[PDB]
């Protein structure tokens, strides 16, 4: 589990939104695993705006944050699970570091902010659904 609190936004992984998000729901799409709500309370959260390659993650099943070198955001066929059939997900990167499927919401950061959250695994690799390209987090 876990989230992006960033201005009066939620990022989280769409397979693991609640009620109160899609009722609240600001953006969504499956082909990433996002979905962002509204929120009351303002965020301390920022996004990063760079192409870094390096950065480190949070890891639950080692309650553990790890540096890890990561592929750019990228195409790629994610195997089925107990939430998605086995599929093409977008703007996803990969990294050699462990994960768990409740690993899903961890953050990965870099100098300059937050750059995505754990979205996909296994077998010692690490996915991240990438944030940086969503500029609107930013603003309204
Ligand atoms: C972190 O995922 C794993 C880690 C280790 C082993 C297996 C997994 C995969 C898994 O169970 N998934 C459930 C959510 C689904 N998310 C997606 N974007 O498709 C991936
Ligand atoms: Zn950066």
Redesign the pocket.
């Known amino acids: 589990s876990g989230a992006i609190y960033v201005g009066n936004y939620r990022v989280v992984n769409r397979h693991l939104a609640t009620h109160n998000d899609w009722a609240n729901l600001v953006w969504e799409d499956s082909s990433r695993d996002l979905l962002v709500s509204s929120t009351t309370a303002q965020g301390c959260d920022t996004i990063?705006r760079?192409d870094?390659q390096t950065?480190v993650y949070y890891c639950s099943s080692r309650r553990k944050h790890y540096p890890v070198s990561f592929s750019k955001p990228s195409l790629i066929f994610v195997e089925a699970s107990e939430y998605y059939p086995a599929r093409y997900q977008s703007h996803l990167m990969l990294a050699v570091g462990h994960s768990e499927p409740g690993d899903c919401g961890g953050i990965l950061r870099?100098?300059?902010?937050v750059?995505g959250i754990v979205s996909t695994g296994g077998n010692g690799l690490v996915g991240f659904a990438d944030v940086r390209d969503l500029l609107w987090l930013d603003e309204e």
């Open positions: 990063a760079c870094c950065g870099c100098q300059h902010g750059v």
